[PDB]
Amino acid sequence: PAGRFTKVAAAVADSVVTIESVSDQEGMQGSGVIVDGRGYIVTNNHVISEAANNPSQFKTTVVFNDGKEVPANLVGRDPKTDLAVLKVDNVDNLTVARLGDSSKVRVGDEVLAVGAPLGLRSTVTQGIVSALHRPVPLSGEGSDTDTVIDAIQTDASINHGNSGGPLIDMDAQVIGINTAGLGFAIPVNEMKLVANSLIKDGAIVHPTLGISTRSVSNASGAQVANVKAGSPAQKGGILENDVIVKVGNRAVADSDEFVVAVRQLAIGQDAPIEVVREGRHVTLTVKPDPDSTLEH
Amino acid sequence: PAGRFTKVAAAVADSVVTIESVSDQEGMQGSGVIVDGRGYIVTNNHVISEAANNPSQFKTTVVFNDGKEVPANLVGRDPKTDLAVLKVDNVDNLTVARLGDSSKVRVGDEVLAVGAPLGLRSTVTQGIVSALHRPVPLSGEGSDTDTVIDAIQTDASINHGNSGGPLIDMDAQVIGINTAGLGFAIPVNEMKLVANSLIKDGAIVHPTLGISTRSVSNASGAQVANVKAGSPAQKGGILENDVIVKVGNRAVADSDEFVVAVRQLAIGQDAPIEVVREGRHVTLTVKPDPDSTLEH
Amino acid sequence: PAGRFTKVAAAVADSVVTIESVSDQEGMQGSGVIVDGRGYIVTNNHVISEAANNPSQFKTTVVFNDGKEVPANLVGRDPKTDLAVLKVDNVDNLTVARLGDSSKVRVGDEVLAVGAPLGLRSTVTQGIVSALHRPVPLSGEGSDTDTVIDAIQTDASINHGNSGGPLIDMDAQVIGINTAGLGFAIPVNEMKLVANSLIKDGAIVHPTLGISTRSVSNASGAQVANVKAGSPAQKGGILENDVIVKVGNRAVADSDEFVVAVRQLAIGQDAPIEVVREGRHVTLTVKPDPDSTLEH
């Protein structure tokens, strides 16, 4: 008579792996999920960040459920979503995870934050979804720039032991990727989009406006702190100490939501930015650039 | 096929509101619960504390489930129980919460700490009741005096995102009011009593003895640290460095339980205080005063 | 209609007790579990540590569910497993706990961390098993030496309010002993072995090698930091800055697992220690001594 969560955790264990990167004097471990039978594995960008930035000195391996250790190669990574894709070569009989639909997730849904069973300090935690589409700032691990993501929030503990592993619903389906870098997960629908671009192109392109903001709240939004020269914001009329309240069709509550809303804009297409300037309600038009132009 | 907690959270969402108070350079947000069809809303005293103390510069609104924003007026507040009552005027088709009975709550009962779905960093957390009638100290927000309450304790996370919202049982009934100011909730039976007095009178009166205590434990209770001149304690013979072990019919383990026990006394009626004085077991009689005499 | 966890917590409440040790100017409280009808109670070593080290000034009592207070005497204690056994004399109609089998516990199993209902800040928390056989360091309370144990890890909160109490499965059976000294419990199968030796002999004997280690991880294990003179390690050839990777038949990931693995060796019997010495893979033979020779 195995328990409710015991069954679900056991049903996905074969699909979760330990990811380990080591040099002469450093060792760095995480979890990941098998998402493609050819050997493609999804994890956090901060789990592999140092191996990616120092690939000549770091070696990355994958440890499966049975204990097999296999070399692993970095397909691509996205620090802006704290996502990354690895690939193991010609491994047979892989248990691929079942990818859910994070758009159907609801507050109160019971979830499991599953870490790799063989990880050093591995954890499997249980809780509910506490919030949806919740912008959360994430600290960049190495030279990686900090970022903000629309996260699924859960009161299941997200820690080093299950970071990079899957957030699992009661149907044993992946609805998110745990990120410890009061718990947060990268929703699986964004995960599928980012991993598709990383698998095909080895990188991903996100829109940018050249804006840096700080949060403001009074009788509220993202206050423009710096506008880059020649940027879409500078060419659109966005001024400094403007208070951004809407980017595209998304209302902006603070600096966190501003970062997320910008990534939802269309590159190369006009878009409205609603601001409040010295008390006045002003709307501006910006054409977002790609953040990496030679990959666009 | 919606989940166990998903159903309960969704069934009470229409009854939980976002409470927001703003000035020229300040913004303060919380949650509340609709408890009366005329428009009466219960929240924490620390959610509104600054608007109450600076009403000329702060404006308070209520945001409902559908997104409606409505002005809100402070009916009354009790810092000693960290409770407060707001009122929205002539709002139709209000979903009033179902108030449970906190005296029937038991350790192990599954609960939800529900925050306002539209709050900025809103949360809905899940856990069990971890303790009943647990005295807990609460820090006063502004110039508000600190206090202690008989709390329902839960291992559901109580945070800024669900503070002021309801603690909900598996029957979708309110058994407490969350207070973040390891989680604690104001039991609903005390909530009904305090809100009734605040709705009728705009304030509430609690008994007082003129005693300040610190906790002591050895081969134990509340040690009298200061007795106000002319107080019921001073007129009853209570001395300094007395160790209070019983107030009324309630045993007193420490300073926290002493504060709570005093509030359970009858105003204007004799009551026994059992103390241990230089090793001796002494009982004293005190007649508690109202803490605000012109409202009694 | 009592809840799922409400029933289980209520079914074991009569078997959990408050343990309290007091002097002239100190007071120290914990929880324990009744494991034998003659009056034998199991708790943490850090709950009673100061009464054990200063028995002339500390007095220890047990408070049952109904409220009975009874003197308690220390049978034995093991700081290396943070376990201890008390005994109440000639108490009738004791509700003895049902001891489960921690070897059958699985990740995801629903558990309750039950504290003594009458304890000052007692808690009952709920969660799942997050990891099995997880080495965790524990800080010694008084002059007690720090230690490491193979723990059951749970995301049920382990705190002062339930430390020393039982970790309870959904069959109301004890699978571990809570230790607060992200939660950890002493598995019940080790608990039965340690308590048997403490009840019979008033103490327990654990193997030792004379090794102190620090953790290392690179392209990994316990690095030998100090070898005692004349120790089994010194007589076996173990050198300083050796990197221990296997003790007996147990792989050793870090210093935590090394401590635990040593306690699983046979006293007086040869055993292999696999090390990596200046790049070379070397195996050594050691004969573990008893840590207390006159009790062996």
**Cα gap A151→A133, rounded to integer Å:** 5
For domain A4-88, give its CATH number from 1.20.120.450, 3.40.1190.20, 2.40.10.10, 3.40.50.970.
2.40.10.10
Same CATH fold, B102-201 and B4-88? yes
Instruction: Check B8 against A108: CB less than 8 A apart.
Output: yes
Residue B134's nearest CA partner among B166, B102, B93 is B102
Distance from CA of B129 to the nearest CA of A (A): 15
Give the dihedral of Cα atoms A24, A29, A32, A36; nearest 10 deg. 10
The DSSP bridge partners found for residue B214 are B223
Q: What contacts A45, CB < 8 A, 6 or more positions away?
A: A52, A77, A78, A79, A81, A82, A83, A84, A141, A144
Top CATH class of A102-201 equals mainly beta
Contacts of B6 in chain A (CB under 8 A): 106-109
Contacts of A220 in chain B (CB under 8 A): 22, 27
Radius of gyration of the CA atoms of chain B, in A: 20
The answer to whether C49 and C21 are in contact (CB under 8 A) is no
**Cα gap C114→C7, rounded to integer Å:** 13
**Cα gap C56→C23, rounded to integer Å:** 9
The domains of chain A are located at 4-88, 102-201, 207-295
**Cα gap B136→B154, rounded to integer Å:** 12
Angle at A36 between CA A35 and CA A41, to 5 degrees: 50
Token digits for C226? 């100090």
Residue C101's nearest CA partner among C188, C10, C206, C18 is C188
Angle at C124 between CA C84 and CA A165, to 5 degrees: 95
The answer to whether A167 and A9 are in contact (CB under 8 A) is no
* Chain C residues 140-199 within an 8 A CB cutoff of chain A: 153, 155, 170, 182
Token digits for B152? 């329902």
Q: Does B117 touch chain A (CB under 8 A)?
A: yes
Token digits for A201? 């192109």
Query: How many helices, marked H, and strands, marked E, lie in chain C?
Result: 5, 21
Tell how far CA C247 is from the center of its chain. 21
The shortest CB-CB distance from A110 to any of B3, B27, B161 is to B3
Element (H, E) at C53: helix C45-53
The experimental technique used to determine this model is X-ray
Q: Given phi > 0 = left and psi -120 to 50 = alpha, else beta, which region is A39?
A: left
Question: Hey, is C48 helix, strand or coil?
Answer: helix
Question: Hey, is B164 helix, strand or coil?
Answer: coil
Residue A113's nearest CA partner among A29, A186, A202 is A186
Nearest CA in chain B to C8: B108
The answer to whether C198 and C77 are in contact (CB under 8 A) is yes
The DSSP bridge partners found for residue C238 are none
Q: Does B131 touch chain C (CB under 8 A)?
A: yes
Residue B161's nearest CA partner among B40, B14, B44, B22 is B44
Q: What contacts B98, CB < 8 A, 6 or more positions away?
A: B171, B172, B173, B174
Instruction: Check B6 against A107: CB less than 8 A apart.
Output: yes
Q: Does A2 touch chain C (CB under 8 A)?
A: yes
Sign of the C-alpha dihedral, residues B242, B244, B248, B254? positive
* Residue ranges in C76-125 assigned as alpha helix (H): none
Token digits for B198? 């605040």
For domain A207-295, give its CATH number from 2.60.40.10, 1.10.760.10, 3.40.190.10, 2.30.42.10.
2.30.42.10
- A198-202, long-range: CB within 8 Å, 24+ apart, which pairs? A198/A75, A198/A76, A198/A77, A198/A78, A198/A83, A198/A84, A198/A85, A199/A36, A199/A40, A199/A75, A199/A76, A199/A85, A201/A76, A201/A295, A202/A75, A202/A76
Angle at C61 between CA C57 and CA C62, to 5 degrees: 160
Tell how far CA B6 is from the center of its chain. 27
Q: What contacts A46, CB < 8 A, 6 or more positions away?
A: A82, A138, A140, A141, A144, A163, A179, A181
The answer to whether C164 and C176 are in contact (CB under 8 A) is no
The answer to whether C93 and C121 are in contact (CB under 8 A) is no
Catalytic residue among A21, A31, A46, A231: A46
The DSSP bridge partners found for residue B135 are B150
SS (H, E, C) A239-275: CCCCEEEEECCEECCCHHHHHHHHCCCCCCCCEEEEE
Report in angstroms the alpha-carbon separations of C212 from C63, C224, C278.
40, 6, 19
Catalytic residue among C82, C144, C150, C169: C82
**Cα gap B276→B255, rounded to integer Å:** 15
**Subunits in contact with chain B (3 or more CB pairs closer than 8 Å):** A, C
The answer to whether C15 and C97 are in contact (CB under 8 A) is yes
Token digits for B105? 């709550």
Residue A233's nearest CA partner among A212, A251, A209 is A209
Distance from CA of A150 to the nearest CA of C (A): 25
Instruction: Respond yes or no: is residue A82 known to be catalytic.
Output: yes
Instruction: Check A108 against B22: CB less than 8 A apart.
Output: no
Q: What contacts C163, CB < 8 A, 6 or more positions away?
A: C30, C31, C44, C46, C47, C115, C178, C179, C180, C181
**Subunits in contact with chain C (3 or more CB pairs closer than 8 Å):** A, B
Element (H, E) at B234: helix B232-236
Instruction: Respond yes or no: is residue A291 known to be catalytic.
Output: no
Residue C162's nearest CA partner among C176, C173, C152, C150 is C176
Instruction: Respond yes or no: is residue B122 known to be catalytic.
Output: no
The DSSP bridge partners found for residue B227 are B211
Per this entry, what is the length of chain B? 296
The shortest CB-CB distance from C26 to any of B153, B170, B218 is to B218
The shortest CB-CB distance from C128 to any of A2, A5, A25 is to A5
**Cα gap B167→B203, rounded to integer Å:** 24
The DSSP bridge partners found for residue A237 are none
Q: Does B211 touch chain A (CB under 8 A)?
A: no
